[PDB]
Nucleic acid binder design. Structure first.
Ligand SMILES: Nc1ncnc2c1ncn2[C@@H]1O[C@H](CSCC[C@H](N)C(=O)O)[C@@H](O)[C@H]1O
Length: 327
DNA sequence: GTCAGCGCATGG
DNA sequence: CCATGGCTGAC
């Protein structure tokens, strides 16, 4: 993560829905806001959260009466993406994992917060011939909010990962906010090779396979794109090998392949997958964040999360717009 | 609960 | 043509 000296959000409160690791929390707290409620039902997510923040998130959102919730100013929520991802069955709202959005709607109507800030995958904006996005747009307008959405590739903001996501911000109609804007991009100056650990700590992650085919030569100069050097088996998800001089591919939570959830990389002549910590780093997490003791669960948790750095820049821009109230 | 081989939509 | 991003069955 980046460091914010001008704390544009001091004195405001928010809630953490579908918390996971608490990615939304680090982002907002670094700016000066305060967390007053949280909610996440996965047994293990509940453990890491407690370990790093010191409180236990409430359970199942579908059975929590909306009137218990504390008063707040910003509702943070990165709802489930398996029903909308380009790697799935694309069942949208017909999937019981796809109807969460409406519980958000339910909560919003009662507490009328100043800002709603959500996140989801690139394909959300194109699913069902574009109908799905309209539905979120119209429901938000009807509840008296404005709607702002855009797709941002992580490599345009300092993190070497090809992760494209749609971000959605909604201000309450009576505040009259007319100058919010999405941060401007910049040149990358960090690559996969600048975050790896020493060879003595990753020795157990190596893999020697004899169905290894080489389709390209290792490059000699840095670039901001994924460079495939080889393949194993048939070359499907988790069977592709890239270079440490380019950038990482999207980390996932239920992935397959011999190089599951992270991908394979050629390091100093040997091929291997990434360490939980090297995963924490390509997601922009700080070396002080204690990860879960069970390696397996740790991989899944990272593949489900958000990048910290992008959430930060957008967070700042939000506060700036709320703070401009001239005579 | 963990592992690994898959199979096809979408965007050039 | 060419490359990327969860589901399902096995123990
Ligand atoms: N019905 C429900 N009630 C509560 N939490 C739920 C839920 N359905 C799914 N979840 C949890 O929703 C999360 C969505 S992914 C979000 C990750 C989070 N943004 C990050 O910063 O790490 C998963 O952890 C899932 O276990």
């Amino acid at each position: 993560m980046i460091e914010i000296k001008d704390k544009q959000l001091t004195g405001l409160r928010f809630i953490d829905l579908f918390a996971g690791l608490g990615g939304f929390r680090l982002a907002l707290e670094s700016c000066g806001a305060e967390c007053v409620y949280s909610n996440e039902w996965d047994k293990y997510a509940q453990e890491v959260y407690e370990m790093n923040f010191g409180e236990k998130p409430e359970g199942d959102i579908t059975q929590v009466n909306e009137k218990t919730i504390p008063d707040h100013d910003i509702l943070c929520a990165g709802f489930p993406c398996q029903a909308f991802s380009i790697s799935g069955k694309q069942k949208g709202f017909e999937d019981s994992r796809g109807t969460l959005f409406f519980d958000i709607a339910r909560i919003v109507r009662e507490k009328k917060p100043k800002v709603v800030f959500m996140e989801n995958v690139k394909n959300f904006a194109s699913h069902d011939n574009g109908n799905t996005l309209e539905v979120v747009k119209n429901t938000m307008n009807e509840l008296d909010y404005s709607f702002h959405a855009k797709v941002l590739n992580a490599l345009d903001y300092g993190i070497p990962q090809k992760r494209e996501r749609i971000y959605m911000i909604c201000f309450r109609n009576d505040l009259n906010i007319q100058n919010f804007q999405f941060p401007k991009p910049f040149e990358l100056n960090t690559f996969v090779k600048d975050l790896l650990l020493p060879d003595s700590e990753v020795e157990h992650l190596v893999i020697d396979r004899k169905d290894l085919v080489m389709t390209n030569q290792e490059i000699e100069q840095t670039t901001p794109k994924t460079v495939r050097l080889g393949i194993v088996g048939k070359g499907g998800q988790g069977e592709r090998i890239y270079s440490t001089r380019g950038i990482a591919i999207t980390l996932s939570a239920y992935g397959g392949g011999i190089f599951a959830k992270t991908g394979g990389y050629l390091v100093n002549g040997k091929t291997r997958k990434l360490h939980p910590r090297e995963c924490a780093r390509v997601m922009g997490y700080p070396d002080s964040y204690k990860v879960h003791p069970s390696t397996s669960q740790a991989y899944k948790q990272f593949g489900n999360s958000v990048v910290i750095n992008v959430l930060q820049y957008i967070a700042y821009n939000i506060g700036s717009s709320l703070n401009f109230k001239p005579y």
